[PDB]
């Protein structure tokens with residue numbers, strides 16, 4: 001399924017990478033994307049896959065393009081085109097300065113102060129889930145912890161019932177890792193139809209939850225519309241239900257293979273925040289992009305108005321020009337360079353929430369279950385898309401080596 005090579009794209013810039021099914025997925029998803037950084041591949045290439053689009057392969061280019069919203073607009077930030085065109089989430093499909101006032105509202109509901117507000121529930125839930133698994137001597141990490149821990153905290157934060165998780169999680173995954181089972185537009189509108197009655201209820205009777213706060217905030221000197229509220233809460237749903245979930249899996253899969261890395265963190269827990277950064281770099285997982293607002297020459301390459309460009313947040317930190325021996329996990333790296341939470345004006349608003357969930361996970365897991373591994377003979381499959389992930393992660397351990405606190 002290769003789209004005909006457009007006339008303005010020279011043949012030597014063609015590299016047919018499929019972001020939804022990279023050829024090297026078996027070696028691990030980050031490894032599969034890292035083929036874009038082998039010496040046979042230019043800094044900036046065109047793939048004919050998924051409609052045809054550019055991909056920046058180097059951190060330097062990815063950062064520049066994320067900064068230059070004048071040429072690289074968030075209007076259409078998803079490949080393929082049909083998805084990016086349907087995509088209307090707020091603030092993510094807006095450029096500055098329009099984006100600005102909506103993002104301040106986002107920061108109000110998922111930013112620092114909400115982390116410190118919710119920190120006790122976060123710690124509480126981590127300990128509770130881990131203690132429940134501890135005596136089993138096994139778990140499916142994706143389903144037993146990676147999903148429920150961040151997702152229940154998000155549902156708590158948004159004041160939504162946990163019974164709604166299965167339905168909302170399915171729709172979220174259709175947008176980031178599409179199955180072909182329903183169009184992006186259909187998935188979005190399914191999520192929108194769920195939010196619509198809730199937002200109306202919470203406009204008429206305001207609560208203190210994230211959804212009440214967004215639905216009742218101010219932009220442009222006036223009340224936010226029911227439509228805008230919907231477009232923002234939609235993004236919060238997606239933001240809350242896929243990235244941390246999948247990132248914890250990558251990290252725990254790594255730690256299952258790395259007894260010496262576990263001991264570093266257990267013996268010197270003050271290194272955990274730096275370790276969090278390193279895992280975020282090494283196991284980075286997001287890849288969206290931008291659309292050209294006009295013809296533009298970028299690093300010697302002629303881009304056309306309306307061209308889509310994938311600017312994989314995943315690749316910046318894997319770039320050997322940014323980090324020596326990028327595939328090696330080194331908690332003492334003097335500088336962990338990455339754009340895992342993105343870059344420029346859209347730099348993730350939930351990044352403080354993400355970090356706290358990661359750091360709490362690292363500490364509390366390794367405290368109670370310091371010695372564990374991947375199930376004997378199990379093959380771990382990764383999946384690739386706008387947000388990449390781990391399909392399943394069966395872990396095992398000897399309960400005699402675990403500890404309650």
Ligand code: HEM
Pocket residue numbers: 074077090091092093099103106110235236239240243244247285286288289313339340341342343345346347348349350351353354
């Ligand atoms: C490891 C975990 C996470 C990663 C890797 C991640 C990644 C990213 C990236 C790369 C962007 C920028 C997308 C773009 O430039 O178009 C973004 C935006 C955003 N994310 Fe996250 N995220 C994580 C966790 C979370 C959490 C827990 C939330 C909770 C709500 C959240 C909510 C948001 C929101 C609201 C935006 C939009 C910001 C804006 O457009 O101004 N994220 N994320």
Ligand SMILES: CC1(C)[C@@H]2CC[C@@]1(C)C(=O)C2
Pocket residue numbers: 089092176235238239243286288386387
């Ligand atoms: C790319 C993202 C990670 C960012 C927040 C959720 C996500 C899937 C978006 O649509 C914007």
Ligand SMILES: [C-]#N
Pocket residue numbers: 238239240243348350
């Ligand atoms: C953000 N996800």
Ligand SMILES: [K+]
Pocket residue numbers: 036037038041042043044057058
């Ligand atoms: K390259």
Ligand SMILES: [K+]
Pocket residue numbers: 075076077084085086087088093
């Ligand atoms: K759009």
